[PDB]
Write a protein that binds this ligand. Structure first.
Ligand code: A1ADA
Ligand code: A1ADA
Ligand code: CL
Ligand code: CL
Lengths: 123, 4, 123, 4
């Protein structure tokens, strides 16, 4: 085509979606991880995770307001990944890298799994 | 704005 | 913070949101422009437009499944802007620039209004 | 991945 493109558009969209999340605006699901609850937008979860994409394209699960993750999933690992989904920023540290990689493998977030593998190989 |  | 960042994340998120729109997955509103109907995600509309942000933060309008735009709005101008919201690409042409600028002013899409003003000033 |  003969389109023009606005370089910062995608980043600005994601910043506004995170502002809606922080104010709890139009969130349509709660993700339960052990005792912890995380509110989010189904569309953002699907756009970032192969697991959520599979869950919310399912004709029965698409209508659920509550999703319980496997009890092996660490709430801190999930929180770091949910923050990444809405910001592109990953808080990867020596003390959380194993929990983050295991959660990213479960959520099917291929690019996060790749950087965790590389950082572990370096150490 | 750019030419993509 | 000490975060790392994935450069292509925001663009990849927007690409997946457009894939959901094209397959009509989790769309929660229909925008009526004259006789034409456009299905979309409320969160994406709010993230891109000052007008939709105002509409869907309103305690009564947030629950509407149908929004009718002002009869002066051109369906082609709206279609081009909805495509921009989901892709960052604007199909700006000599034959549509006046309808696109008027629709962007109504939708309160400041960056689109700015490039339309600049392209009109050049001609 | 980059240092933002
Ligand atoms: C694969 N596909 C057509 C598609 N369309 C729409 C969406 Cl929201 C989607 N999301 C998704 C699927 C798989 C994966 C991801 C998002 C991230 C990842 O590492 N794997 N995937
Ligand atoms: C202004 N604010 C706190 C905010 N938070 C969340 C959202 Cl979704 C939002 N969107 C929005 C508001 C105004 C404008 C836009 C999006 C695009 C524009 O040109 N003006 N604006
Ligand atoms: Cl990823
Ligand atoms: Cl804009």
């Amino acid at each position: 085509d003969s389109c023009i493109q606005f370089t910062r558009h995608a980043s600005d969209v994601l910043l506004n979606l995170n502002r809606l999340r922080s104010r709890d605006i139009l969130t349509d699901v709660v993700i339960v991880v052990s005792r912890e609850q995380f509110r989010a937008h189904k569309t953002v979860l699907m756009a970032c995770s192969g697991l959520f994409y599979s869950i919310f394209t399912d004709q029965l699960k698409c209508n659920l307001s509550v999703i319980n993750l496997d009890p092996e999933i660490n709430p801190e690992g999930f929180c770091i990944l949910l923050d990444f989904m809405y910001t592109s920023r990953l808080n990867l540290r020596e003390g959380n890298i194993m929990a983050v990689m295991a959660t990213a493998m479960y959520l099917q977030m291929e690019h996060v799994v790749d950087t965790c593998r590389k950082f572990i190989k370096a150490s | 704005w750019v030419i993509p």
